[PDB]
Design a protein around this ligand. Sequence first.
Ligand SMILES: C[S@@+](CC[C@H](N)C(=O)[O-])C[C@H]1O[C@@H](n2cnc3c(N)ncnc32)[C@H](O)[C@@H]1O
Ligand SMILES: C[S@@+](CC[C@H](N)C(=O)[O-])C[C@H]1O[C@@H](n2cnc3c(N)ncnc32)[C@H](O)[C@@H]1O
Ligand SMILES: C[S@@+](CC[C@H](N)C(=O)[O-])C[C@H]1O[C@@H](n2cnc3c(N)ncnc32)[C@H](O)[C@@H]1O
Ligand SMILES: C[S@@+](CC[C@H](N)C(=O)[O-])C[C@H]1O[C@@H](n2cnc3c(N)ncnc32)[C@H](O)[C@@H]1O
Ligand SMILES: C[S@@+](CC[C@H](N)C(=O)[O-])C[C@H]1O[C@@H](n2cnc3c(N)ncnc32)[C@H](O)[C@@H]1O
Ligand SMILES: C[S@@+](CC[C@H](N)C(=O)[O-])C[C@H]1O[C@@H](n2cnc3c(N)ncnc32)[C@H](O)[C@@H]1O
Lengths: 232, 232, 231, 232, 231, 231
Amino acid sequence: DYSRQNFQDLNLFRGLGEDPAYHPPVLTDRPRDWPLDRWAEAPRDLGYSDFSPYQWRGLRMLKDPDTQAVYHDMLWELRPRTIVELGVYNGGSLAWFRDLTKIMGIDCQVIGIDRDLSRCQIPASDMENITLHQGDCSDLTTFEHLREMAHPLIFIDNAHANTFNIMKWAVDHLLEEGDYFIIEDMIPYWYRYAPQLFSEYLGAFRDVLSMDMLYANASSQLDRGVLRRVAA
Amino acid sequence: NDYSRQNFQDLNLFRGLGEDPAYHPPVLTDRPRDWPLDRWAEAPRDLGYSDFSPYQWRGLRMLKDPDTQAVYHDMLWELRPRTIVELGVYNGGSLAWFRDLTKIMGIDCQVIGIDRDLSRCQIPASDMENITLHQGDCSDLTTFEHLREMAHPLIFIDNAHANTFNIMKWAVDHLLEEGDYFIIEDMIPYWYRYAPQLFSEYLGAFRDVLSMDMLYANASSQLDRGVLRRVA
Amino acid sequence: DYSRQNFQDLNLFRGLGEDPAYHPPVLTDRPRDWPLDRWAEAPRDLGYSDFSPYQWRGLRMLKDPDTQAVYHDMLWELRPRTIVELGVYNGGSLAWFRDLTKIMGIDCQVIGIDRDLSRCQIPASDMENITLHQGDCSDLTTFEHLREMAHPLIFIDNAHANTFNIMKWAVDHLLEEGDYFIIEDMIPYWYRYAPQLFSEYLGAFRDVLSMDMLYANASSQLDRGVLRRVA
Amino acid sequence: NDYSRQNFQDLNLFRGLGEDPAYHPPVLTDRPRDWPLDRWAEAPRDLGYSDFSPYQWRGLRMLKDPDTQAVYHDMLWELRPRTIVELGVYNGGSLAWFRDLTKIMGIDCQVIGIDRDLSRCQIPASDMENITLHQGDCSDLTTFEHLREMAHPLIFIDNAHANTFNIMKWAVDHLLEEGDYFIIEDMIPYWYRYAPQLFSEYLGAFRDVLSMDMLYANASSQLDRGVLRRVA
Amino acid sequence: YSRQNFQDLNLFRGLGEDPAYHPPVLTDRPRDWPLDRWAEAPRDLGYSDFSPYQWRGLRMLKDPDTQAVYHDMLWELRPRTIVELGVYNGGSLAWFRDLTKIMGIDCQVIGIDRDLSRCQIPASDMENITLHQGDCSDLTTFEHLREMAHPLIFIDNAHANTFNIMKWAVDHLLEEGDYFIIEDMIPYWYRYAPQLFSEYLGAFRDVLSMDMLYANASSQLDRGVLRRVAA
Amino acid sequence: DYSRQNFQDLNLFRGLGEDPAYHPPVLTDRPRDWPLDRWAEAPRDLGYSDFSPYQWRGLRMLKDPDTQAVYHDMLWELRPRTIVELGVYNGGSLAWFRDLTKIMGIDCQVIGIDRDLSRCQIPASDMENITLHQGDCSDLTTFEHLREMAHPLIFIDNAHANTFNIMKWAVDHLLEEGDYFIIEDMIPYWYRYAPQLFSEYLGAFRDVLSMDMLYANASSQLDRGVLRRVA
Ligand SMILES: C[S@@+](CC[C@H](N)C(=O)[O-])C[C@H]1O[C@@H](n2cnc3c(N)ncnc32)[C@H](O)[C@@H]1O
Ligand SMILES: C[S@@+](CC[C@H](N)C(=O)[O-])C[C@H]1O[C@@H](n2cnc3c(N)ncnc32)[C@H](O)[C@@H]1O
Ligand SMILES: C[S@@+](CC[C@H](N)C(=O)[O-])C[C@H]1O[C@@H](n2cnc3c(N)ncnc32)[C@H](O)[C@@H]1O
Ligand SMILES: C[S@@+](CC[C@H](N)C(=O)[O-])C[C@H]1O[C@@H](n2cnc3c(N)ncnc32)[C@H](O)[C@@H]1O
Ligand SMILES: C[S@@+](CC[C@H](N)C(=O)[O-])C[C@H]1O[C@@H](n2cnc3c(N)ncnc32)[C@H](O)[C@@H]1O
Ligand SMILES: C[S@@+](CC[C@H](N)C(=O)[O-])C[C@H]1O[C@@H](n2cnc3c(N)ncnc32)[C@H](O)[C@@H]1O
């Protein structure tokens, strides 16, 4: 029935899905064990929904395998001492960045920054190398607090509110040479909707930032949003 | 160096809309408008401008694309609605359209337009016969409690997408009679990716009161599986 | 039925279909009302032939919505007083130009020309500002007989017969600075079969005609065929 | 003013035929015919000329593309035809091809050409063995009587497409035998797209006497769904 | 199954299990589809489109698009001698001979291979074709033939030791205007060894050239048509 | 020039490439730093050969990120105490498996096998729990010399010789309920090249092995190769 129900806002779920806990996909319309003597007879598509079906030790990943492939290459090149996500959801990306700099012999500090850090599904006792922080984007004191951080640094942006003042402040009071400011997912959508202003705003950074063309065309998500600092 | 001699804005605002609600025509960059016929074959065969939201009607911007337009023609012609409503307004270009078409078709419709910010609206006052703007939110349902029993048949369109199931719930129990439509543009395919289970339920609780109208349902990218009506 | 039925030269319908009168599409492999408790299991395709579904007030359209949006832009910018369609079929294009100019507030006179106006479907009543004309294109008296038209103006060829002579006449006798001559559909085809002869022809007009590259690439049907007097 | 005194031949004449029935091989424009191997990779990968009707056979043009040819090759092998009829000659390239193949295959097969206009036929007289041309129109069925009952089996091929069903009618009642082919190259899809109802109803008529040969019928773009043959 | 031996399915790579031509068979539908249900009939081919091709009851691994190219090439440059290196069932062999026969070309076909046993050409049908057993690794398999008339086309369908074989040809065989072609494999050699293939290939700039008329005209011959240049 | 040089049989590089050591991509047609005042005018294509540009801590990877996602999910479910790569080339996938089971907290011992181990690239400082063997697949001795190892067990065929015969001995002598046996890459090629046999051979194992549909369709490389043991 409809007349006895109250509905949520499914907008809260965009680019995220329902639940930050991992769901292990199950098959509906086929047996896991397909009989081999009917090999050709078996269906070729997935079996389940390919929305965001990507995990890391039972923790959901918002970055697809290609975006992972990029971040791996980038990490192995820069040996980044600090990696700062800005937008956390379930924390999987944080548990990845840690687990990865670890086997790379990079002693790295991974920092999450979300105003709501309650969706984090990481075990209490898996949090070696990590520092969370609560703070809204429209206030720049949030980011000052972490200025005595080792370099090289990679600032990823995954909320993307007040991003441009965060960039202006970054350049003016944080990024050393060849540190990465990365805007994930949205940059093309800003050029879709607002071409005149975007091309002005980005174009203002002409002399301090620049797109890194090794990584910038190498994944759907990072497409055209990977930046770093120059000498000037 | 233009970075610090500028204050930057929020550009998330323009998502789906574009920076200016007033119509500006396309202009050409890499070609002339007047291609010489001696070199007809040399002519570039691509468009020449942002294919984002080029469309228009009588000098006002239009967000419904030509296919969508088409569908609402066939729809209006078949149904002959005495009322159409547009939750969500922006430049009010689609209101002018709905009004002009019904007029040409001999239909005595009244177009309504419910926004919170009508300031963007662009129609000349002098050209507003059979159009009414109401202000208010999609959160609380009083915005709609003053919508009189206007004439039927009646088409409801959601374009804001906020609390758009509680507004569905109100429309079914208070307003829609047989044959009346209720159309969620744009958003139904994204809600289905981001919540396959929850959406399939919320939507299914209208089993006995609403059916998707296949004739128009799969005939536009914007109206894609977002066209519903009553059969009580 | 093979030893009885006699047949209709089915080439007649090449391009237009069987019935010039509109008939809404009906479903076949479907209910119209798909149940919402099965929303995710409903077909995604259209469910009816997408040949020419398009219409304008019970009249057939053979200008897909995209082409429709082009001429609209064109009509808005130019504000023409005359729009000569050439080839009528059902006259859906006729009524839709007169309707559209009407809302735009423009004093416009639509004129269809065709060797056969017997499939025109326009209601008797809805004929304000539409002047029909009978005559073959391979007769240039079809064109002389025309009284003087007002400007600015657009000339649309959908008959694609003896078209280059008709370009010669129109330039010589009718078209003014800024006026369009628009060949729908056919340009790429001629350029596919006779590329050498097509250029020869098109290129003669280099001093009197240009491709308006603002509209020229904005619709399959108008693909590289929107011309107008640069003068 | 090159237009003032240019004799404008009617361009509709060349529909799917071209300017000239005489074969002339294609010609490079933007690229040297011999490419230097030092710059191998920077050599362009697009054809070079117009893919409109590039094909040929012994200096005669071929309107039947290689996909269509393969089909005819397999059908000639299987059927070992004793007679083959073309309705619509043009340059008669297909006429030569059909005969040259039947000779190689070791098949006594008279080839026959029918056309109201045989002035474009390019087959030299010295190479006319086993090929009989025929002046005549489609409308007039008298034309087909003097097919002096040729030997079977037998492939009828409609390339003219005029009064076609009224030829089919004749052929069935007068010329075809258990296994003989009646084939309509190209049009069948276009008639279905233009006259959906009347075409099914017309094609339905020949149900008892004819079948589509599903082996060949989906086998080339040009022969597509128009390879028919005598059942029972 | 536990006392079974399984063959190397890589022996059948790009060839298939049987060198004989058998004709395709429809499983899921009738050969004779009924005309009342014409619109419901499958649009898809109806069987495996991997090497479905044949010439007079022999399998053809050259597909139609490639045959059209070789025809143009034969017709233009009447060759006195064609050389396949790679034979399989010999359909390319008896094809190359048959075309030359209808063209009035006095042309000798020769096929060379370490394995001929898979050849399906009957003895009655060997006129002007000649088989040879020899290995690529060994260059002395080839000098047997520098008493062969020109013009000459020389196809590589084997892919072993190719670059050494090319250089033997350029030095000891090809006269100006003659063809050496590599079917299928150049584009994979470029994929796999960008730097080494470009080298091995650009060594022959002073003696060979990519024929641009014949090169981009099939899948199989992609960028492998080469010929001898003016000295 | 050519007549001096010796040419490696370029087919040795089929599916692998020239250098087994990793090298990072190098841009040719663009700077690495594109200026922001002309962001919109930058190229959208990659900038290098997408042939096999993937890596893992300085070692090349021939499994693509898709395939690496499937192998993750698999490991995390099975927690294999033994993985067996059959074919090794640069040893990169050998390491990746060892690295990943390690951080998952699994005590898994990775095993590679090859006829040729000289290409392998893994530093000995970083060799923990990786065991190599030399041996042809040809010879069933290669495997009988393999010592007992712990389950659960994934057995990957990445080299594709004698692949079915190996499967037979794997089922008889090595595999156990729940253990895998995955033929990466080749199975879809064997279906096109040899359908009749490929089915008779695969289906001969119907009683013992099954296609794990959860992973067997989630990667173009693993596509329809993922088998697993089941009583
Ligand atoms: C939208 S999610 C990340 C999704 C990711 N961009 C994707 O689609 O792949 C970003 C997180 O940042 C938080 N967030 C949004 N705006 C913020 C702000 N202004 N300051 C701090 N956190 C914010 C949200 O609560 C949310 O959990
Ligand atoms: C997609 S635009 C409207 C499109 C409009 N029908 C047209 O085509 O011209 C979305 C509109 O919804 C309005 N809107 C967004 N959130 C709203 C809310 N919570 N309550 C009422 N209106 C809202 C915005 O002001 C905006 O004008
Ligand atoms: C394609 S239909 C018209 C299309 C329609 N007006 C539109 O806007 O899309 C072409 C029309 O031109 C007519 N026609 C064909 N040949 C003609 C000729 N030689 N002279 C005059 N009219 C001709 C036909 O009778 C037919 O009605
Ligand atoms: C497409 S061409 C022939 C194609 C050629 N047979 C082939 O191999 O594909 C069409 C031919 O039909 C002929 N034709 C057109 N109308 C005809 C008619 N009414 N009666 C007989 N032949 C006609 C034309 O002269 C023209 O040569
Ligand atoms: C692709 S098939 C030949 C294709 C066929 N001739 C055609 O025209 O399409 C490959 C052939 O090359 C032969 N071959 C492979 N390696 C060879 C070598 N090293 N020496 C001689 N022949 C070889 C094989 O015996 C096999 O017959
Ligand atoms: C696709 S690569 C293996 C990639 C491997 N997964 C990795 O990255 O670690 C193929 C390998 O199979 C090996 N190989 C080929 N034939 C073989 C055979 N008959 N016996 C053993 N190894 C063989 C080759 O030497 C080559 O190293």
